[PDB]
Motif scaffolding. Structure first.
Motif, PDB file in Angstrom:
ATOM      1  N   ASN A   5       0.828  -1.201   0.000  1.00  0.00           N
ATOM      2  CA  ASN A   5       0.000   0.000   0.000  1.00  0.00           C
ATOM      3  C   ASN A   5       0.864   1.253   0.000  1.00  0.00           C
ATOM      4  O   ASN A   5       0.619   2.187  -0.773  1.00  0.00           O
ATOM      5  CB  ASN A   5      -0.938  -0.008   1.207  1.00  0.00           C
ATOM      6  CG  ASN A   5      -2.042   1.026   1.096  1.00  0.00           C
ATOM      7  OD1 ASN A   5      -1.791   2.196   0.812  1.00  0.00           O
ATOM      8  ND2 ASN A   5      -3.277   0.595   1.324  1.00  0.00           N
ATOM      9  N   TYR A  22       6.547  18.941 -14.005  1.00  0.00           N
ATOM     10  CA  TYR A  22       6.902  19.205 -15.391  1.00  0.00           C
ATOM     11  C   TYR A  22       5.989  20.263 -15.990  1.00  0.00           C
ATOM     12  O   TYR A  22       6.448  21.151 -16.719  1.00  0.00           O
ATOM     13  CB  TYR A  22       6.842  17.912 -16.202  1.00  0.00           C
ATOM     14  CG  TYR A  22       7.757  17.910 -17.403  1.00  0.00           C
ATOM     15  CD1 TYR A  22       9.131  17.785 -17.249  1.00  0.00           C
ATOM     16  CD2 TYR A  22       7.250  18.036 -18.687  1.00  0.00           C
ATOM     17  CE1 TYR A  22       9.974  17.785 -18.342  1.00  0.00           C
ATOM     18  CE2 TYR A  22       8.087  18.037 -19.787  1.00  0.00           C
ATOM     19  CZ  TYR A  22       9.447  17.912 -19.608  1.00  0.00           C
ATOM     20  OH  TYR A  22      10.282  17.911 -20.699  1.00  0.00           O
ATOM     21  N   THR A 305      23.855  17.223 -21.975  1.00  0.00           N
ATOM     22  CA  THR A 305      22.940  16.779 -23.013  1.00  0.00           C
ATOM     23  C   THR A 305      22.986  17.719 -24.216  1.00  0.00           C
ATOM     24  O   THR A 305      23.561  18.810 -24.172  1.00  0.00           O
ATOM     25  CB  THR A 305      21.511  16.693 -22.476  1.00  0.00           C
ATOM     26  OG1 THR A 305      21.009  18.014 -22.239  1.00  0.00           O
ATOM     27  CG2 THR A 305      21.477  15.901 -21.178  1.00  0.00           C
ATOM     28  N   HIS A 334      11.605  15.982 -15.102  1.00  0.00           N
ATOM     29  CA  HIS A 334      11.947  14.637 -15.570  1.00  0.00           C
ATOM     30  C   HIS A 334      13.204  14.642 -16.446  1.00  0.00           C
ATOM     31  O   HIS A 334      13.172  14.374 -17.646  1.00  0.00           O
ATOM     32  CB  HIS A 334      10.755  14.041 -16.311  1.00  0.00           C
ATOM     33  CG  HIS A 334      10.959  12.630 -16.774  1.00  0.00           C
ATOM     34  ND1 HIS A 334      10.134  12.031 -17.702  1.00  0.00           N
ATOM     35  CD2 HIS A 334      11.886  11.701 -16.439  1.00  0.00           C
ATOM     36  CE1 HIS A 334      10.545  10.794 -17.919  1.00  0.00           C
ATOM     37  NE2 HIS A 334      11.609  10.571 -17.169  1.00  0.00           N
ATOM     38  N   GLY A 335      14.331  14.953 -15.814  1.00  0.00           N
ATOM     39  CA  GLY A 335      15.606  14.844 -16.495  1.00  0.00           C
ATOM     40  C   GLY A 335      15.866  15.920 -17.521  1.00  0.00           C
ATOM     41  O   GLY A 335      16.612  15.689 -18.477  1.00  0.00           O
ATOM     42  N   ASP A 336      15.266  17.099 -17.352  1.00  0.00           N
ATOM     43  CA  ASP A 336      15.483  18.181 -18.305  1.00  0.00           C
ATOM     44  C   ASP A 336      16.876  18.777 -18.144  1.00  0.00           C
ATOM     45  O   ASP A 336      17.676  18.778 -19.086  1.00  0.00           O
ATOM     46  CB  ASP A 336      14.405  19.248 -18.127  1.00  0.00           C
ATOM     47  CG  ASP A 336      14.286  20.167 -19.325  1.00  0.00           C
ATOM     48  OD1 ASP A 336      15.105  20.049 -20.258  1.00  0.00           O
ATOM     49  OD2 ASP A 336      13.358  20.999 -19.337  1.00  0.00           O
TER      50      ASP A 336
ATOM     51  N   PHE B 124      -0.819  -4.049 -12.327  1.00  0.00           N
ATOM     52  CA  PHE B 124      -1.553  -4.763 -11.292  1.00  0.00           C
ATOM     53  C   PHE B 124      -1.758  -6.217 -11.688  1.00  0.00           C
ATOM     54  O   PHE B 124      -2.455  -6.512 -12.664  1.00  0.00           O
ATOM     55  CB  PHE B 124      -2.903  -4.095 -11.021  1.00  0.00           C
ATOM     56  CG  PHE B 124      -2.820  -2.913 -10.096  1.00  0.00           C
ATOM     57  CD1 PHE B 124      -1.615  -2.263  -9.882  1.00  0.00           C
ATOM     58  CD2 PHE B 124      -3.946  -2.462  -9.428  1.00  0.00           C
ATOM     59  CE1 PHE B 124      -1.538  -1.181  -9.029  1.00  0.00           C
ATOM     60  CE2 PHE B 124      -3.875  -1.381  -8.573  1.00  0.00           C
ATOM     61  CZ  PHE B 124      -2.669  -0.739  -8.373  1.00  0.00           C
ATOM     62  N   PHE B 154      -9.723   2.183   0.672  1.00  0.00           N
ATOM     63  CA  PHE B 154      -8.324   1.840   0.890  1.00  0.00           C
ATOM     64  C   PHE B 154      -7.879   0.831  -0.156  1.00  0.00           C
ATOM     65  O   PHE B 154      -8.582  -0.153  -0.412  1.00  0.00           O
ATOM     66  CB  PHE B 154      -8.100   1.269   2.292  1.00  0.00           C
ATOM     67  CG  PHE B 154      -8.056   2.307   3.376  1.00  0.00           C
ATOM     68  CD1 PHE B 154      -7.821   3.638   3.071  1.00  0.00           C
ATOM     69  CD2 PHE B 154      -8.232   1.951   4.703  1.00  0.00           C
ATOM     70  CE1 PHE B 154      -7.772   4.594   4.067  1.00  0.00           C
ATOM     71  CE2 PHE B 154      -8.185   2.902   5.704  1.00  0.00           C
ATOM     72  CZ  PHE B 154      -7.954   4.224   5.386  1.00  0.00           C
ATOM     73  N   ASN B 155      -6.721   1.092  -0.768  1.00  0.00           N
ATOM     74  CA  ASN B 155      -6.091   0.176  -1.714  1.00  0.00           C
ATOM     75  C   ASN B 155      -6.957  -0.021  -2.953  1.00  0.00           C
ATOM     76  O   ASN B 155      -6.727  -0.946  -3.739  1.00  0.00           O
ATOM     77  CB  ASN B 155      -5.788  -1.163  -1.034  1.00  0.00           C
ATOM     78  CG  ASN B 155      -4.670  -1.922  -1.714  1.00  0.00           C
ATOM     79  OD1 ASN B 155      -4.030  -1.415  -2.634  1.00  0.00           O
ATOM     80  ND2 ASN B 155      -4.407  -3.135  -1.241  1.00  0.00           N
ATOM     81  N   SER B 162      -0.196   6.912 -17.275  1.00  0.00           N
ATOM     82  CA  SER B 162       0.339   7.276 -18.576  1.00  0.00           C
ATOM     83  C   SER B 162       1.864   7.235 -18.597  1.00  0.00           C
ATOM     84  O   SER B 162       2.531   6.918 -17.609  1.00  0.00           O
ATOM     85  CB  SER B 162      -0.145   8.668 -18.978  1.00  0.00           C
ATOM     86  OG  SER B 162       0.470   9.064 -20.187  1.00  0.00           O
ATOM     87  N   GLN B 166       7.846  14.004 -24.555  1.00  0.00           N
ATOM     88  CA  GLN B 166       8.237  15.247 -25.198  1.00  0.00           C
ATOM     89  C   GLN B 166       9.672  15.136 -25.686  1.00  0.00           C
ATOM     90  O   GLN B 166      10.480  14.417 -25.091  1.00  0.00           O
ATOM     91  CB  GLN B 166       8.118  16.445 -24.245  1.00  0.00           C
ATOM     92  CG  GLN B 166       6.717  17.007 -24.090  1.00  0.00           C
ATOM     93  CD  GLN B 166       6.033  16.527 -22.829  1.00  0.00           C
ATOM     94  OE1 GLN B 166       6.613  15.779 -22.044  1.00  0.00           O
ATOM     95  NE2 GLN B 166       4.805  16.980 -22.612  1.00  0.00           N
ATOM     96  N   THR B 168      11.904  17.205 -25.278  1.00  0.00           N
ATOM     97  CA  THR B 168      12.774  17.839 -24.297  1.00  0.00           C
ATOM     98  C   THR B 168      13.306  16.868 -23.252  1.00  0.00           C
ATOM     99  O   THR B 168      14.175  17.256 -22.465  1.00  0.00           O
ATOM    100  CB  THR B 168      12.030  18.978 -23.605  1.00  0.00           C
ATOM    101  OG1 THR B 168      11.039  18.434 -22.725  1.00  0.00           O
ATOM    102  CG2 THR B 168      11.349  19.862 -24.636  1.00  0.00           C
ATOM    103  N   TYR B 169      12.808  15.635 -23.210  1.00  0.00           N
ATOM    104  CA  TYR B 169      13.328  14.665 -22.257  1.00  0.00           C
ATOM    105  C   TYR B 169      14.789  14.343 -22.555  1.00  0.00           C
ATOM    106  O   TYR B 169      15.319  14.650 -23.627  1.00  0.00           O
ATOM    107  CB  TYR B 169      12.510  13.374 -22.283  1.00  0.00           C
ATOM    108  CG  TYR B 169      11.081  13.499 -21.804  1.00  0.00           C
ATOM    109  CD1 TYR B 169      10.626  14.653 -21.180  1.00  0.00           C
ATOM    110  CD2 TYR B 169      10.188  12.450 -21.965  1.00  0.00           C
ATOM    111  CE1 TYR B 169       9.321  14.758 -20.740  1.00  0.00           C
ATOM    112  CE2 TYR B 169       8.885  12.548 -21.528  1.00  0.00           C
ATOM    113  CZ  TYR B 169       8.456  13.700 -20.917  1.00  0.00           C
ATOM    114  OH  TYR B 169       7.155  13.796 -20.484  1.00  0.00           O
ATOM    115  N   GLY B 170      15.442  13.714 -21.582  1.00  0.00           N
ATOM    116  CA  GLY B 170      16.808  13.282 -21.778  1.00  0.00           C
ATOM    117  C   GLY B 170      16.908  12.125 -22.751  1.00  0.00           C
ATOM    118  O   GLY B 170      15.926  11.456 -23.075  1.00  0.00           O
ATOM    119  N   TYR B 173      15.773   8.653 -21.635  1.00  0.00           N
ATOM    120  CA  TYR B 173      14.336   8.483 -21.472  1.00  0.00           C
ATOM    121  C   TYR B 173      13.564   8.723 -22.763  1.00  0.00           C
ATOM    122  O   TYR B 173      12.331   8.685 -22.751  1.00  0.00           O
ATOM    123  CB  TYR B 173      13.816   9.396 -20.360  1.00  0.00           C
ATOM    124  CG  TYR B 173      14.303   9.003 -18.981  1.00  0.00           C
ATOM    125  CD1 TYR B 173      13.985   7.762 -18.445  1.00  0.00           C
ATOM    126  CD2 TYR B 173      15.089   9.861 -18.223  1.00  0.00           C
ATOM    127  CE1 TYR B 173      14.426   7.388 -17.187  1.00  0.00           C
ATOM    128  CE2 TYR B 173      15.537   9.500 -16.965  1.00  0.00           C
ATOM    129  CZ  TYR B 173      15.203   8.259 -16.452  1.00  0.00           C
ATOM    130  OH  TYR B 173      15.644   7.890 -15.202  1.00  0.00           O
TER     131      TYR B 173
END
Ligand SMILES: *[C@@H]1O[C@H](CO)[C@@H](O[C@@H]2O[C@H](CO)[C@@H](O)[C@H](O)[C@H]2NC(C)=O)[C@H](O)[C@H]1NC(C)=O
Ligand SMILES: *[C@@H]1O[C@H](CO)[C@@H](O)[C@H](O)[C@H]1NC(C)=O
Lengths: 584, 193
Positions: A5, A22, A305, A334-336, B124, B154-155, B162, B166, B168-170, B173
């Motif tokens: 949990n 972000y 980068t 996120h790693g920008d 899951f 709960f739970n 998602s 983009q 712009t990510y490294g 990634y």
């Protein structure tokens, strides 16, 4: 149970927080690039959504009671998420409470202040003209031009703050703690095992015993400055009273626009004209930054980068197209890992560049410990990393070995004094201010008596500390921590205190393992891999390991150590100590 | 002569997801592998137990092609005797398998501005997935505070999340496009050569 949990709730926390962060960073980028104020409206909307969602997470933190039987390592995250924060309270109280600080700030940007009785050079209190319209040594036409300004500001600050301090006492009464002053220091506790707990009052026990033996450091500083003021004109220091406080231009004690040039008493040695001699070569902003990676290929640290060099904004504008130019490095989620500083080419531009260069390399060390440890590991190291590499790069022998400065001009043994005067000046005059201010700050919200008796003892304290007094005192229309954008808005203020000590600690840490004979000032950075290897492991720690255990394992350190600072300049303290026996 | 169309499979238009992906069948075909060997566009072409020179001379009864998209860092983490969230809850490979794995980079096509949220993941499940698994069922995760009877207590929360995308990510990634070649020998005649 079995930490599913908690794992799932924290992972959903990570996902939603990364998305929101972000979004907020992208909104900030779009705002500072293509400002339209609806991007700022969406900024506010996303921030409010984030705040409400985080408050709901705080409510759902009531999902599992802890007690004591468990002994996990995720307990740090558990308490971090169970932290009350701004949660609780009535929906009516804090809803109007948070509408106070922003509307307080509005009376500052809309106010216009310029030279009194002088229609010429009349312009807003902005750094474009302030440097020359305020920090000029004038005596006759400057004395009465600031009392009116600081009485105009403090016309309503006492009546506003007397209610503000008691209205923030509701968070003190519902913060699960006992005192608002100790609320700040109640979050620094570091325990991983018995014997490495942080004692809440360990500072008051260790530091105060050692503050007595460092007394002569301060009395004799004043004897130095009198070598200039008393020399020129016999009307600054009246014998009846003490030295004036208006002609300095800055009571904050951070920058010196006129003391710094006329600092060396002899003034016969030739200064450095590096910028004038180097402008012909063609070293612009893009031609500059290669030094960091030239060092780091010898060290071994990862390169930047493609977006890092794709996002520089180091070009001049076309015609008056100004933007918000300030030193700002951001993680952007996120790693920008983007740096934003619209800088031109100057001498101090070197001191700038490395200082925010260090931030991104330090951040690129703990990216493997999720958003739980992607935060700042410690409040002091964050600026120390940026400044330590810069001060080390500021070595003349470092700047000669590259192949630029001719070997005919060999280093001298007296210019290091001029180099380090301002370095030892800017980081020594603040520690007593901060130490008095923070403890008495935690004292004054107790409210034993209101604030009409403290200022009387303030002057006696200052006279017995340094001996500063003005001939005709003012009325009670001031508030020192009020007219400050970095104090009134309630940030972390020991962060401007800690950075002085840890930089020298780490400089000693490198110089004790640099295998260098001779002096201890010739420590140089280039062509050294062991230091980087032993440093990266310390950077890549985060909130996993207490700093106490880390320093124990590295060298052994239960607490702060300032004797490295003392012994690293005592061989240079002879000039401050033995030549100052003819004055008090 | 009568070559098998790998190009339509590779340079596709509508792309596969990682939790609803389907098998592809290869039968009655001819193998053209020198193109793959000298493709010159390969993020990670590493595989052990098979040599590319003699892989031309080998023939198999059935061939399954598997293509999906994952985060760039974990491209080499997919291997026998490996672990991780994807390995333990999303996709697992048999240990005895001896095929080849190839990695591509698709920032110029897959990514866009706005964080394309179409791509999903299935986290899951009560246990770990058996090798070569495909199911449409969405069996209730046995976590009912008291009932999870469609009630948010709960739970009991939304299990689908998602993966933003983009440019712009490294680099680590950026979305990498990964295809999997399945090799096995069956007693039935191997008309694929
Ligand atoms: C920033 O980029 C936008 C993108 O086109 C420029 O134009 C704005 O576009 C938005 C969205 O289409 C419109 O709502 C605005 O009316 C446009 N004009 C603006 C914001 O002035 C915009 O011109 C760019 N900003 C700058 C300063 O160049
Ligand atoms: C696949 O990539 C592009 C896009 O369709 C295409 O031009 C290229 O020729 C293809 N690669 C092959 C056929 O190897």
């Amino acid at each position: 149970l079995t930490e599913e949990n908690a794992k799932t709730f924290l992972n959903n926390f990570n996902q939603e927080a990364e998305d929101l962060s972000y979004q907020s960073s992208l909104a900030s980028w779009n705002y500072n690039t293509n400002i339209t104020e609806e991007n700022a409206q969406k900024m506010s909307e996303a921030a409010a959504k984030w705040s409400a969602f985080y408050e709901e997470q705080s409510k759902t933190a009531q999902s599992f009671s802890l007690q004591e039987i468990q002994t996990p390592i995720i307990k740090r995250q558990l308490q971090a998420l169970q932290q009350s924060g701004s949660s609780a309270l009535s929906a009516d109280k804090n809803k109007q409470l948070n509408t106070i600080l922003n509307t307080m700030s509005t009376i500052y940007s809309t106010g216009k202040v310029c030279n009194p009785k002088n229609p010429q050079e009349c312009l807003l209190l902005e750094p474009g003209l302030d440097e020359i319209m305020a920090t000029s040594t004038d005596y006759n036409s400057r004395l009465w031009a600031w009392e009116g300004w600081r009485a105009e500001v403090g016309k309503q600050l006492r009546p506003l703050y007397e209610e503000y301090v008691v209205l923030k006492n509701e968070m003190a009464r519902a913060n699960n703690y006992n005192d608002y002053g100790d609320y700040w220091r109640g979050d620094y506790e570091a325990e991983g095992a018995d014997g490495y707990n942080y004692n809440r009052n360990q500072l008051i026990e260790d530091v105060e015993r050692t503050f007595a033996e460092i007394k002569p450091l301060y009395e004799h500083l004043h004897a130095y400055v009198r070598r200039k003021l008393m020399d020129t004109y016999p009307s600054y220091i009246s014998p009846t009273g003490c030295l004036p406080a208006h002609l300095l231009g800055d009571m904050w004690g951070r920058f010196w626009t006129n003391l710094y040039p006329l600092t060396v008493p002899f003034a016969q040695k030739p200064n450095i004209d590096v910028t004038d001699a180097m402008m012909n070569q063609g070293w612009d902003a893009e031609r500059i930054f290669q030094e960091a990676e030239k060092f780091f290929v010898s060290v071994g640290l990862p390169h930047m980068t493609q977006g890092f060099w794709a996002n520089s904004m180091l070009t001049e504008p076309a015609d008056g197209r100004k933007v918000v130019c300030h030193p700002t490095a951001w993680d952007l989620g996120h790693g920008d890992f983007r740096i934003k500083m619209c800088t031109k080419v100057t001498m101090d531009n070197f001191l700038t560049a490395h200082h925010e260069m260090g931030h991104i390399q330090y951040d690129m060390a703990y990216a493997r410990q999720p958003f739980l440890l992607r935060n700042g590991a410690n409040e002091g190291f964050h600026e120390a990393v940026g400044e330590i590499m810069s001060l080390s790069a500021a070595t003349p022998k470092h700047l000669k070995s590259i192949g630029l400065l001719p070997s005919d001009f060999q280093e001298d043994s007296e210019t290091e004094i001029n180099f380090l005067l301002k370095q030892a000046l800017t980081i020594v005059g603040t520690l007593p201010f901060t130490y008095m201010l923070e403890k008495w700050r935690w004292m004054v919200f107790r409210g034993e008596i209101p604030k009409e008796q403290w200022m009387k003892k303030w002057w006696e304290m200052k006279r017995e500390i340094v001996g500063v007094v003005e001939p005709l005192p003012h009325d009670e229309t001031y508030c020192d921590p009020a007219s400050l954008f970095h104090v009134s808005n309630d940030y972390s203020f020991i962060r401007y205190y800690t950075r002085t000590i840890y930089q020298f600690q780490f400089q000693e840490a490198l110089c004790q393992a640099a295998k260098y004979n001779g002096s201890l000032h010739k420590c140089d950075i280039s062509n050294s891999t062991e230091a980087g290897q032993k440093l990266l492991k310390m950077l890549s720690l985060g909130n996993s390991e207490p700093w106490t255990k880390a320093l124990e394992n590295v060298v052994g350190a239960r607490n702060m150590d300032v004797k490295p600072l003392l012994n690293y300049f005592q061989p240079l303290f002879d000039w401050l100590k033995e030549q100052n026996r003819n004055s008090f | 002569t009568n070559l098998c169309p790998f190009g339509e499979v590779f340079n596709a238009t509508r792309f596969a997801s990682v939790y609803a992906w389907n098998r592809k069948r290869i039968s009655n075909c001819v193998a053209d592998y020198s193109v793959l060997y000298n493709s010159a566009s390969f993020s990670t072409f590493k595989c052990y137990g098979v040599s590319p020179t003699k892989l031309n001379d080998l023939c198999f009864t059935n061939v399954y092609a598997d293509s999906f998209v994952i985060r760039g860092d974990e491209v080499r983490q997919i291997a026998p005797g490996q672990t991780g969230n994807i390995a333990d809850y999303n996709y697992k490979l048999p240990d005895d398998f001896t095929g080849c794995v190839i990695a591509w980079n698709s920032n110029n096509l897959d990514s866009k501005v706005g964080g394309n949220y179409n791509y999903l993941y299935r986290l899951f499940r009560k246990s770990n997935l058996k090798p070569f698994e495909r199911d449409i069922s969405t069996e209730i995760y046995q976590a009912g505070s008291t009932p999870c009877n469609g009630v948010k207590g709960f739970n009991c929360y939304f299990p689908l999340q998602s993966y933003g995308f983009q440019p712009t990510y490294g680099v680590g990634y950026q979305p990498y496009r990964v295809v999997v070649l399945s090799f096995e020998l069956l007693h039935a005649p191997a008309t694929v050569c």
